[PDB]
Design a protein that fits this description.
The structure is cut from a larger assembly and holds 3 copies of chain A (70 residues), 1 copy of chain B (429 residues) and 1 copy of chain D (79 residues). Chain A is built from 3 helices and no strands. With 70 residues, chain A is mainly α. Chain D is elongated. Classes of the chains: A mainly alpha (70), B mainly beta (429), D mainly alpha (79). Chain A: This is Dolichyl-diphosphooligosaccharide--protein glycosyltransferase subunit STT3A.
Amino acid sequence: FDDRAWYPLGRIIGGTIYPGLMITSAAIYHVLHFFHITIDIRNVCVFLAPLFSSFTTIVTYHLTKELKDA
Amino acid sequence: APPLINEDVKRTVDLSSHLAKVTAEVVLAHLGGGSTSRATSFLLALEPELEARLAHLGVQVKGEDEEENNLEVRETKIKGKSGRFFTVKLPVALDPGAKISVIVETVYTHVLHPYPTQITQSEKQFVVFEGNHYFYSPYPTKTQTMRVKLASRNVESYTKLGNPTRSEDLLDYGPFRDVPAYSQDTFKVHYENNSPFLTITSMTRVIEVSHWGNIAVEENVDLKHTGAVLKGPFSRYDYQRQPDSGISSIRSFKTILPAAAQDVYYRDEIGNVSTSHLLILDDSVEMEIRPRFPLFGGWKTHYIVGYNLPSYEYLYNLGDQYALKMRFVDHVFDEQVIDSLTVKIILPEGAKNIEIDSPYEISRAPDELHYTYLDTFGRPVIVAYKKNLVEQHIQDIVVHYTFNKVLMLQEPLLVVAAFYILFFTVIIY
Amino acid sequence: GDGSRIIFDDFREAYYWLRHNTPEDAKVMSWWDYGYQITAMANRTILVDNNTWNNTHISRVGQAMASTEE
Amino acid sequence: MELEAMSRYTSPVNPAVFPHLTVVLLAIGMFFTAWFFVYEVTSTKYTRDIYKELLISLVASLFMGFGVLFLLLWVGIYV
Amino acid sequence: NCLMYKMCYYRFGQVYTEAKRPPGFDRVRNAEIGNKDFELDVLEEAYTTEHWLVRIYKVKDLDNRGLSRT
């Protein structure tokens, strides 16, 4: 619960958010840090979009292959 | 103790900026007869009002070898007497009826207090100093004079003991005569001082050395303008239009970076700062740093400067033996004033037998352990603290450790496993 | 006129001034576009924010901006 | 054992050298990696041999692992 | 006379915005502002950025003597 915004009402954050992006970023952050690739979390956020926008090229390959041919 | 006296003293007090340098040429002389011993040392004393604020004290014999004529000084306590004392070892003993001239140099911090404590943009800055007319020393003084050099000729009030003469921006006192030991008389002066009252409230100096030919240094600096606090609004319009506006304000300062400093970056918590002008002189990389905003008194700012250096400018070696030399700290600006410095030196992991030849006393914390890309054991970190630091502390330090040939090649071997096992996972799958 | 990139950082300059030179409990009123920027960079409390979950509060801020100074 | 009498060290891999090695080693590792995967996806329960897969994968690991190192040094994330 | 106009164009009326234009020329409206000289009574100018891109005001505390601000 965040009391720094919408003063004096505050905002319920976890009740009013789609957490999947953050969970993805936190998971990647903890995976990299486990190997001590101590990347700053800001970089993980900045470069998260290119990574999945690369994976979507493979998902699109398979999705079209199943409709037509390779 | 043998009976020494201060047979002559000439004191220069320099108040031209946010620090109070004090110089005393003293002709220390031996009073004793031949029954007395040859005196090997003499005492110096700090006035209890100022001993809390003494940043540096140095002594040297009158003579051209300034780099070698520095005398060894030790902080000492005399039984039953209040205040800090220092013992100075002479290069040659002083015989009965001999004399020597020594020069004492001291720097006090925070001893110039704004008064009034608050000003508008258009008002000027006045500061009060409270020192002493007399050379506070354990020994009587035959005759002494003082010269006080002010930051500007606009003296508002001063203490008129002895009918002092005044000319331009200087005051001239005495001669006082046959002054007893430990004597005091509180010299007070109130005068205009517009010099840059900057204080580094905290700096973190991180030195990261690798045997990949690179040492990377980063200086997190917390900077406060300790001048007279701004009262009322900040008119941007008047600050642009009139040159008189905020004449105490700090626009910029210039940092003298190591001659070798490559890849100098200047950035913040919130991103880059595109305002620094960098110039590469043959002796030094001059860098003008302009903060994001001008500092009026009691405004604060924070920034990070770092840079890379080549190894062979500062490393030395004897096979398995390695030792970094460092000049002790960066020259952020002349007369820079720092409250609290934290220096971390991060050796390669597997550095062993770590020893350090500190130039002077510095608090040393237990070695941390630090983990970064491709680290497993972790890099051993030297951590030290000290406080109340000044430009005379840009001295030298040397640090000695053992390391081995193979350990650098271990790093790639440790990489390779992570991909080999990926391939093996594919095979098994 | 020489084709050098002129840069204006004034948004970050202002938010950093807020961050360091104002009491840590101060409340900054702003139009709801900038609420995420003030909250992220200045770390100060705000009245209204981009996710307009309370149109009444945004209207209460617009009424204060549009009304006369008295 | 005091300063001016001693020696000094630097990496024998000199500043200018890394841009070459990184390219060469990564090219080689990409070759052997492509070979590995083409061999694995083409061959079959009766036509694979472990010792070939192991040698190809070990070589591709050696070259890639050192190529990435020199790549990160070229970037200047000095280990 | 609204609050926003008074906050935006405070002192601005005397700035030589251009060489061919009179003082108080607005680069966006291409108009010389109509109300050039006024005082703010319940705000004091806390910080105006170098290019005036962002302006922040401090809302004056309640008058110490119970006088009205008019």
